[PDB]
PDB file of C-alpha atoms and ligand atoms in Angstrom:
ATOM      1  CA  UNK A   1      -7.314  24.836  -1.965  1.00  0.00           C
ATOM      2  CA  UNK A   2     -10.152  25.733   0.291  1.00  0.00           C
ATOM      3  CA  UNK A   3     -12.961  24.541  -2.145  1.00  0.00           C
ATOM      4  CA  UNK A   4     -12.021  20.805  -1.300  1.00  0.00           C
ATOM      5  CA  UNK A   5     -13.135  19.051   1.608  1.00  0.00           C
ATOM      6  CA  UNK A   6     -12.276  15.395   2.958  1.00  0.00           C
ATOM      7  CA  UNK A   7     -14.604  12.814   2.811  1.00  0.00           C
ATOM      8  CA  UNK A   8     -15.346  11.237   6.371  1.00  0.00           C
ATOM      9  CA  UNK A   9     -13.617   7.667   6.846  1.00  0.00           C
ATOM     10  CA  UNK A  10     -17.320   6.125   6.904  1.00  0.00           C
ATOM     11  CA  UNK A  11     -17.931   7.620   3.619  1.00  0.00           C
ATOM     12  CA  UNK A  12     -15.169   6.735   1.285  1.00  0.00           C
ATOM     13  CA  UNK A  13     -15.322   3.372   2.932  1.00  0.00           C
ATOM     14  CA  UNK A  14     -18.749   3.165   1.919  1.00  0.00           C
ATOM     15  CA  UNK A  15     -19.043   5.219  -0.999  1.00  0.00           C
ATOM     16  CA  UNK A  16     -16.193   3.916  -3.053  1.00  0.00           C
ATOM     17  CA  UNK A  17     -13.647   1.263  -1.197  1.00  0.00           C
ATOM     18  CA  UNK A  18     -16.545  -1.503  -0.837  1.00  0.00           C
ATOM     19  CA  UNK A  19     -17.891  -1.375  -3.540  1.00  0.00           C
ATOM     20  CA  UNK A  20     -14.509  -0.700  -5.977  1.00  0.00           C
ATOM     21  CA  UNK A  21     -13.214  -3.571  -4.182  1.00  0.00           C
ATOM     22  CA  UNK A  22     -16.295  -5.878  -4.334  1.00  0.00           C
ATOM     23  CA  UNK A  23     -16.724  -5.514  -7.783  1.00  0.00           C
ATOM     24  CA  UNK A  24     -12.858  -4.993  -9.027  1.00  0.00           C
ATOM     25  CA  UNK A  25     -10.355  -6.143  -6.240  1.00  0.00           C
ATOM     26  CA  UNK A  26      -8.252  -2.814  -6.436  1.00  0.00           C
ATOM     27  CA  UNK A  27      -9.095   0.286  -5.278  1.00  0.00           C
ATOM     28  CA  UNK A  28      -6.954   3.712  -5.724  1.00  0.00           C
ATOM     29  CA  UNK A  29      -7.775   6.711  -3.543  1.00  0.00           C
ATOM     30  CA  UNK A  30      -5.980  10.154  -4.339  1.00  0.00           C
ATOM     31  CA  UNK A  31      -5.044  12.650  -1.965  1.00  0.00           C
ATOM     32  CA  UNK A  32      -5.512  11.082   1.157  1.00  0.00           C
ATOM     33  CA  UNK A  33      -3.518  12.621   3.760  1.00  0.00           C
ATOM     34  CA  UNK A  34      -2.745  15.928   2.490  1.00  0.00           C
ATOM     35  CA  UNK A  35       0.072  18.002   1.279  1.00  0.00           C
ATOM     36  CA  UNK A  36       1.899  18.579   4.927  1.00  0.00           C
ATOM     37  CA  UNK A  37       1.412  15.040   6.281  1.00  0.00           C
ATOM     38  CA  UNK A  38       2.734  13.436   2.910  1.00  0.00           C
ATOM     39  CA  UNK A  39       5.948  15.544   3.314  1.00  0.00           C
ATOM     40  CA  UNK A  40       6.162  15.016   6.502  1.00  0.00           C
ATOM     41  CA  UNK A  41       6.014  11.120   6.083  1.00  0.00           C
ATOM     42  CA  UNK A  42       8.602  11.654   3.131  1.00  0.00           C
ATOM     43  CA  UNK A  43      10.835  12.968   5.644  1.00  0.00           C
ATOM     44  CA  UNK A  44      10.588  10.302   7.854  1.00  0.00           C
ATOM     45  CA  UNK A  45      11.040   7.593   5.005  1.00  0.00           C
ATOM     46  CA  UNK A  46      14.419   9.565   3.902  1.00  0.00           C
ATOM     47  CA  UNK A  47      15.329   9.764   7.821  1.00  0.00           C
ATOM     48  CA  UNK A  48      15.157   6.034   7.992  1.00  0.00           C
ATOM     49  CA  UNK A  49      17.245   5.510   4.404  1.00  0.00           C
ATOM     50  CA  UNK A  50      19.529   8.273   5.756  1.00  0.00           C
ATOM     51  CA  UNK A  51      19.846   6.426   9.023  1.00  0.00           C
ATOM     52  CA  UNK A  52      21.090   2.946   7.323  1.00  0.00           C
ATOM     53  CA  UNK A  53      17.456   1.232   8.663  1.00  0.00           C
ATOM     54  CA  UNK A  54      16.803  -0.296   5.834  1.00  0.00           C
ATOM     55  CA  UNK A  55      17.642  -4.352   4.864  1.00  0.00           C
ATOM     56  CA  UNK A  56      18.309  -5.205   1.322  1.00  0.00           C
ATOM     57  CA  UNK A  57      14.838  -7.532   0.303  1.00  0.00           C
ATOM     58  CA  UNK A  58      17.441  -9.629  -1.458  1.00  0.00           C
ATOM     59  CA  UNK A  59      18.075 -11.397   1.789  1.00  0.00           C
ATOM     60  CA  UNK A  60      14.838 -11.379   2.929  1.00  0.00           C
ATOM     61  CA  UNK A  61      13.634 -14.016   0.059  1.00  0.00           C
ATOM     62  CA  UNK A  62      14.467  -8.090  -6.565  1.00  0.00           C
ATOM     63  CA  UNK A  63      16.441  -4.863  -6.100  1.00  0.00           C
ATOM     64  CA  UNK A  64      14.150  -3.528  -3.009  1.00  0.00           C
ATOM     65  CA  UNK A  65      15.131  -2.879   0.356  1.00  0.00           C
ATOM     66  CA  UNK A  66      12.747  -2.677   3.499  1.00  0.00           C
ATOM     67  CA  UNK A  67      12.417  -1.789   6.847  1.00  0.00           C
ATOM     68  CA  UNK A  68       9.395  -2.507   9.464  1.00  0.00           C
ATOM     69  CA  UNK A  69       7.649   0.076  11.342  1.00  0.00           C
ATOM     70  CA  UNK A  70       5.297  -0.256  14.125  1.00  0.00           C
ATOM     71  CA  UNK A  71       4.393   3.724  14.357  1.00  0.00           C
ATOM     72  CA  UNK A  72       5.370   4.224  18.266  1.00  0.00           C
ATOM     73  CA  UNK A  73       8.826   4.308  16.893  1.00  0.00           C
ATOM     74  CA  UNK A  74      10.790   7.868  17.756  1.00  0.00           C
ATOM     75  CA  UNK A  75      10.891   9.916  14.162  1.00  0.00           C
ATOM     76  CA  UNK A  76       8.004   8.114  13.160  1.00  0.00           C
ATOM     77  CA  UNK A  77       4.996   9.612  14.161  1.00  0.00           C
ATOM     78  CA  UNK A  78       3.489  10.466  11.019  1.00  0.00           C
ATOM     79  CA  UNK A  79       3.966   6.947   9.407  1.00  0.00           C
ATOM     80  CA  UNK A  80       2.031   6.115  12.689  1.00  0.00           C
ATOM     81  CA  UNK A  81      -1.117   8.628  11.729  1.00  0.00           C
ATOM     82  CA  UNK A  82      -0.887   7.024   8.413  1.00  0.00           C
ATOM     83  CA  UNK A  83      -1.212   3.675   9.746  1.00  0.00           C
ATOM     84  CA  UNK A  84      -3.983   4.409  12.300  1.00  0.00           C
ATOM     85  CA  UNK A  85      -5.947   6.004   9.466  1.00  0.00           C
ATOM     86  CA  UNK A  86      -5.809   2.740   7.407  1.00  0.00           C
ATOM     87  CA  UNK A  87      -7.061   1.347  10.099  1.00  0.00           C
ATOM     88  CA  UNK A  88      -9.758   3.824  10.598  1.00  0.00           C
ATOM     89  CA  UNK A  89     -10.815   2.685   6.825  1.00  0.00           C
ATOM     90  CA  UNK A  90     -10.812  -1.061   7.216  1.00  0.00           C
ATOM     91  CA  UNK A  91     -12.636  -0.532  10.860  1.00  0.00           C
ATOM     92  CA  UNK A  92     -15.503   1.210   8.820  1.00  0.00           C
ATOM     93  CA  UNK A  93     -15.250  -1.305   5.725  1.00  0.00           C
ATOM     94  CA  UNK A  94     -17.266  -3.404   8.279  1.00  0.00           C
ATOM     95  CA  UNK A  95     -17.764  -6.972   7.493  1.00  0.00           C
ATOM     96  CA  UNK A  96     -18.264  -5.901   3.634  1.00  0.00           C
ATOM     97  CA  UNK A  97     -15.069  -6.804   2.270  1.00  0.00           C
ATOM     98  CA  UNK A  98     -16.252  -9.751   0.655  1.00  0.00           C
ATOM     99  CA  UNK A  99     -16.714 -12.974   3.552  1.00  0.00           C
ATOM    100  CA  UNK A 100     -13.694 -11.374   5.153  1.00  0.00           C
ATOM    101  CA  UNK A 101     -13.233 -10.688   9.020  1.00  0.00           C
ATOM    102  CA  UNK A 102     -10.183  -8.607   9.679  1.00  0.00           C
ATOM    103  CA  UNK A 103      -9.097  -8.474  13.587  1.00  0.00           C
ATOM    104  CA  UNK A 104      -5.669  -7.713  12.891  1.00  0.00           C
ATOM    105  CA  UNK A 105      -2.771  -6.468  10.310  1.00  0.00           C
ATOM    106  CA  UNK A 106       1.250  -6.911   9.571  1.00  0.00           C
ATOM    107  CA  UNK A 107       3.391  -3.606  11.111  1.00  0.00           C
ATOM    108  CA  UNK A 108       4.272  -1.248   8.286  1.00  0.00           C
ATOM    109  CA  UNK A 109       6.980  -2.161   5.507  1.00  0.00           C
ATOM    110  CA  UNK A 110       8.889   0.214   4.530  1.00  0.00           C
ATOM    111  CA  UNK A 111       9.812  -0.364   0.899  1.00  0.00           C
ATOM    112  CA  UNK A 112      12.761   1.766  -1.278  1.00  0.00           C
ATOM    113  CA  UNK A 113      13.902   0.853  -4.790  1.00  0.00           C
ATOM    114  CA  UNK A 114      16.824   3.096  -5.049  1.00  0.00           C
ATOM    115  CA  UNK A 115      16.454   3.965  -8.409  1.00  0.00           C
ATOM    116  CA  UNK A 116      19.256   2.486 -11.272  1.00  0.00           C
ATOM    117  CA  UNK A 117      16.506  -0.011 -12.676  1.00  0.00           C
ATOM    118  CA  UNK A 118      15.376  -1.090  -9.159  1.00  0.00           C
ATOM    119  CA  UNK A 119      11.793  -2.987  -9.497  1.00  0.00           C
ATOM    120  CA  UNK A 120       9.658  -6.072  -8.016  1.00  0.00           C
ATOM    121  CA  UNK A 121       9.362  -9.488 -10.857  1.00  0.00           C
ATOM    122  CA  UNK A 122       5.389 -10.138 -11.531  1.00  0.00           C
ATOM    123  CA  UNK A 123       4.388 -11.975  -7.843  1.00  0.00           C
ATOM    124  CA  UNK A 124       1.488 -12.776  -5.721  1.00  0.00           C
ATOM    125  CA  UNK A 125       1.567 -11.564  -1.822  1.00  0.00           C
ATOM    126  CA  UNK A 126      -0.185 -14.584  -0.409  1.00  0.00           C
ATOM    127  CA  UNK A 127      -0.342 -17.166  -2.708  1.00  0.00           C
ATOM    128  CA  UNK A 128       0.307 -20.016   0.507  1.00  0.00           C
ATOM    129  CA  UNK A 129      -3.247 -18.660   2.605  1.00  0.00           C
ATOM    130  CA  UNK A 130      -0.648 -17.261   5.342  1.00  0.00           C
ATOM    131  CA  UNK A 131      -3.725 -14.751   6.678  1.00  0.00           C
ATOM    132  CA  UNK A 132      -3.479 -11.370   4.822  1.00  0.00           C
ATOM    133  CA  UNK A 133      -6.715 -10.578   2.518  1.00  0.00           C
ATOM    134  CA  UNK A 134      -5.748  -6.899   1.915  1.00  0.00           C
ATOM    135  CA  UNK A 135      -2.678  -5.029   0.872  1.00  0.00           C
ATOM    136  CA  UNK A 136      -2.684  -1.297   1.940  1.00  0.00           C
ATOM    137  CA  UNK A 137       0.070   0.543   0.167  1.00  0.00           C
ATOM    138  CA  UNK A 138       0.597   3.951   0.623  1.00  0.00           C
ATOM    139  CA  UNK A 139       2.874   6.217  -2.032  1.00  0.00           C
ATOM    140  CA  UNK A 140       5.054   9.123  -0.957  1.00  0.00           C
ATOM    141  CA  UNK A 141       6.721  10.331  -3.694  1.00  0.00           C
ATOM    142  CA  UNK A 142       6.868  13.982  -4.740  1.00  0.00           C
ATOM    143  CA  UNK A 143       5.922  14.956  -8.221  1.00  0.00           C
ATOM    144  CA  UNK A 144       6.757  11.283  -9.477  1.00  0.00           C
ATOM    145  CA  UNK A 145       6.606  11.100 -13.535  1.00  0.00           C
ATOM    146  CA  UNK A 146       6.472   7.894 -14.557  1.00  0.00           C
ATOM    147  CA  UNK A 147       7.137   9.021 -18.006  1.00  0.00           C
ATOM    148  CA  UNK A 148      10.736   9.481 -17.078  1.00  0.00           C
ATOM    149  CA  UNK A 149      11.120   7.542 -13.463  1.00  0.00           C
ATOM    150  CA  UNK A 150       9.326   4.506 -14.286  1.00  0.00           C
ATOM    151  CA  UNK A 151       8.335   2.459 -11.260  1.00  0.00           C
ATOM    152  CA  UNK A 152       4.593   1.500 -11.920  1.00  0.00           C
ATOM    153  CA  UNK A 153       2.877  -0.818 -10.580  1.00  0.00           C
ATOM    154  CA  UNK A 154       1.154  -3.335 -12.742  1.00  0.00           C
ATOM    155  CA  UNK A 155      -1.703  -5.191 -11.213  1.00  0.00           C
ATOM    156  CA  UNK A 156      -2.870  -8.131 -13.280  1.00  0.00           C
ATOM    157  CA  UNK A 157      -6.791  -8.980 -11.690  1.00  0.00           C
ATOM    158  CA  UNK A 158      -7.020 -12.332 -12.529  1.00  0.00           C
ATOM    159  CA  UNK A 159      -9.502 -14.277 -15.396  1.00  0.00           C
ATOM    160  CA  UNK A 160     -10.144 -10.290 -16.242  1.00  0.00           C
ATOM    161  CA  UNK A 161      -9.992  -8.198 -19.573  1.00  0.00           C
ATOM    162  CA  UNK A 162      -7.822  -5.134 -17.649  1.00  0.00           C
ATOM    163  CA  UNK A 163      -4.981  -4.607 -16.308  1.00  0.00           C
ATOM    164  CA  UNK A 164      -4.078  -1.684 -13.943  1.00  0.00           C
ATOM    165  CA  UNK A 165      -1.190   1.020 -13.806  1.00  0.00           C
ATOM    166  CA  UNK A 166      -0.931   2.066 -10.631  1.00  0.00           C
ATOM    167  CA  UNK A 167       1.771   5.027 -11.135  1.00  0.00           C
ATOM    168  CA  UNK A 168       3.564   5.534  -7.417  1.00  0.00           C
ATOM    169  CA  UNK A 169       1.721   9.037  -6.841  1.00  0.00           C
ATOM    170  CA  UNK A 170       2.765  11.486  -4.224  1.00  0.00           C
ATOM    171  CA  UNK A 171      -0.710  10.466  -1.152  1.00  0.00           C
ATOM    172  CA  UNK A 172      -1.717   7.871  -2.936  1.00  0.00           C
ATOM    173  CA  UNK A 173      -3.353   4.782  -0.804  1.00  0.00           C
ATOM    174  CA  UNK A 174      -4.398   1.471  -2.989  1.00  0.00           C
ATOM    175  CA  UNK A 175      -6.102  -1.600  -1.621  1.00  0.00           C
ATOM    176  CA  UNK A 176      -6.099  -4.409  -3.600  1.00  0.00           C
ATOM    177  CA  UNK A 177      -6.701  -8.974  -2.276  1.00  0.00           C
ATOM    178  CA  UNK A 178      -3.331  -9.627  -1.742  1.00  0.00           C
ATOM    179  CA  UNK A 179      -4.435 -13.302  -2.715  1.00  0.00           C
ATOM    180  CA  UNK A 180      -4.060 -15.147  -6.233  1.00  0.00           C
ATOM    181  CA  UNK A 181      -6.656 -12.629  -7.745  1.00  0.00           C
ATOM    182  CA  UNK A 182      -3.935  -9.672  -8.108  1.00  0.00           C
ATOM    183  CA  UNK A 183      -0.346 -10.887  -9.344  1.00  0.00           C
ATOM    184  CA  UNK A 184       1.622  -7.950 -10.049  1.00  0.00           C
ATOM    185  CA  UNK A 185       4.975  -6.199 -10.332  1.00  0.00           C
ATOM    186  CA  UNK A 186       7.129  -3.234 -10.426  1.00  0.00           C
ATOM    187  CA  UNK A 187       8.239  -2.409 -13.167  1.00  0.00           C
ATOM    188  CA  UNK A 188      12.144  -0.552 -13.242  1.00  0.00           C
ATOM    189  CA  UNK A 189      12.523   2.719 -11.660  1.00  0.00           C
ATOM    190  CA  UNK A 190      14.592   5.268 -12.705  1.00  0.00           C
ATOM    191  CA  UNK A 191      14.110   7.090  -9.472  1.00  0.00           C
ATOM    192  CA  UNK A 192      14.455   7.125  -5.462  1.00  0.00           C
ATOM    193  CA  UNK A 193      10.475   5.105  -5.136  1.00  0.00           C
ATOM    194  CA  UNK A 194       9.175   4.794  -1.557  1.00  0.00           C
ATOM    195  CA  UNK A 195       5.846   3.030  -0.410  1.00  0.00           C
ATOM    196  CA  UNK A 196       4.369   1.959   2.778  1.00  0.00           C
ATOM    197  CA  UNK A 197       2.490  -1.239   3.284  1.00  0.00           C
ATOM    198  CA  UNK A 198       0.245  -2.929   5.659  1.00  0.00           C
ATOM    199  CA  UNK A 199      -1.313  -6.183   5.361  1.00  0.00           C
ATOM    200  CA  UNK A 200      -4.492  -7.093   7.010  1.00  0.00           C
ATOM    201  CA  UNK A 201      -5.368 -10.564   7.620  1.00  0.00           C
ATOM    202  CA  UNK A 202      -8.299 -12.405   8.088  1.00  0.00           C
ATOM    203  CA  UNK A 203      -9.475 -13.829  11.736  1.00  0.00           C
ATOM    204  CA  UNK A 204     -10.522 -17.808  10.370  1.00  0.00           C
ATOM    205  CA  UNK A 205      -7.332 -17.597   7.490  1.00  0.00           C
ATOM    206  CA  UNK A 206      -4.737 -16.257  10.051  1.00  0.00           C
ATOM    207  CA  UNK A 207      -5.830 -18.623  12.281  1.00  0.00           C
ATOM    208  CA  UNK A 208      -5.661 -21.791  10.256  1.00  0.00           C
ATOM    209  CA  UNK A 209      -1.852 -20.426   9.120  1.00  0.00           C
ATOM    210  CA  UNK A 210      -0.583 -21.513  12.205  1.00  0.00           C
ATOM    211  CA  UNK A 211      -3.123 -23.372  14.200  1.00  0.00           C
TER     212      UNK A 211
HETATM  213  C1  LIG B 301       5.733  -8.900  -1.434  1.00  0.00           C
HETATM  214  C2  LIG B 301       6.169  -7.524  -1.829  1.00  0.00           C
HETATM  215  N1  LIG B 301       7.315  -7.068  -1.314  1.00  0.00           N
HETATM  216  C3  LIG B 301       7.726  -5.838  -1.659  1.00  0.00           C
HETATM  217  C4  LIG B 301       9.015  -5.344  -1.074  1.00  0.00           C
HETATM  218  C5  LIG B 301       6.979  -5.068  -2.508  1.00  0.00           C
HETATM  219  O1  LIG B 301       7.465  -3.835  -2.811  1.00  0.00           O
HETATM  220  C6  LIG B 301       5.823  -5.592  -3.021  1.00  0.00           C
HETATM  221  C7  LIG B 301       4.929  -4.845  -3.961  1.00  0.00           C
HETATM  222  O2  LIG B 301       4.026  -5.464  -4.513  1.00  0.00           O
HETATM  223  N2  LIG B 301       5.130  -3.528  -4.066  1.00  0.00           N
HETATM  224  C8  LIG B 301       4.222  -2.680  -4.810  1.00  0.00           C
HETATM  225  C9  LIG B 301       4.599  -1.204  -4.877  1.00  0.00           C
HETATM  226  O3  LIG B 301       5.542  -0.802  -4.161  1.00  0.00           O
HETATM  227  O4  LIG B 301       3.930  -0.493  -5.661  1.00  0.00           O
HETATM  228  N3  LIG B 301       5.382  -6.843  -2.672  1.00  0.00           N
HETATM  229 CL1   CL B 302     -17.934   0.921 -12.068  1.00  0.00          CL
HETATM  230 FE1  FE2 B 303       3.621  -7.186  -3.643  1.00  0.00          FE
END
């Protein structure tokens, strides 16, 4: 609809993800990519399912299964966009993500749960200070009803009154500290459920990880 108009990377970085995050630790932006590139980045998602890329996540400790993406990758050009327009966010979220200094982020997992009950047991991303400050997930499923399909994911902020439902929405992109302060899982789905996540790290926290 032509009435709508997307807000400049410096602006919703700004405008909304500092502070949201700052004050909250998750953030959920709607719509972010568009109708076309969403469908388009469905289509490469089901090309690498179709294409047997994916590893069962049992193996790589849970009913998930992953693969990694860099975005250079033939048939994966638009999962590329997407990732170079995270970045485009973070670059403009400054130094104002709390004491953070982010130089650098994971490649791209891939995530399915392939329905039949599929989810993710309440866990914390980096609970061992490996690096990564932020998880960036981005959701890619078309006309998702959680009503019927299931596959939310619960965010427990922690030492807070709230929880949040996070419902795996078609363009969806959610930031949340991938630290101690969000535990969460996903709860069964009932449905194909695809996401895309990046991690960014930290410059001093990566580097003590392995230094
Ligand atoms: C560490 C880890 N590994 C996998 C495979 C995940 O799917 C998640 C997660 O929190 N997923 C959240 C979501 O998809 O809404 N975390
Ligand atoms: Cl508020
Ligand atoms: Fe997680």
């Amino acid at each position: 609809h032509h009435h709508h108009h997307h807000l400049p990377a410096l602006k919703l970085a700004l405008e909304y993800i500092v502070p949201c995050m700052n004050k909250h630790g998750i953030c959920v932006v709607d719509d972010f990519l568009g109708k076309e590139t969403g469908q388009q980045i469905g289509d490469e998602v089901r090309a690498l399912h179709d294409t047997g890329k994916f590893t069962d996540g049992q193996l790589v400790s849970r009913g998930d299964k992953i693969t990694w993406i860099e975005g250079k990758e033939p048939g994966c050009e638009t999962i590329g966009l997407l990732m170079s327009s995270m970045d485009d966010l973070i670059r403009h979220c400054n130094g104002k993500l709390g004491s953070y200094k982010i130089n650098g982020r994971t490649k791209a997992m891939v995530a399915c749960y392939p329905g039949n009950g599929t989810g993710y047991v309440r866990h914390v991303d980096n609970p061992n200070g490996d690096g990564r400050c932020v998880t960036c997930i981005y959701y890619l499923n078309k006309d998702w009803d959680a009503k019927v399909s299931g596959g939310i994911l619960r965010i427990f902020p922690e030492g807070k009154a709230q929880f949040a439902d996070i419902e795996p929405k078609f363009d969806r992109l959610l930031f949340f500290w991938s630290d101690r302060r969000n535990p969460h899982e996903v709860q069964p789905a009932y449905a194909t459920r695809y996401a895309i996540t990046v991690w960014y790290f930290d410059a001093d926290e990566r580097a003590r990880a392995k230094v």
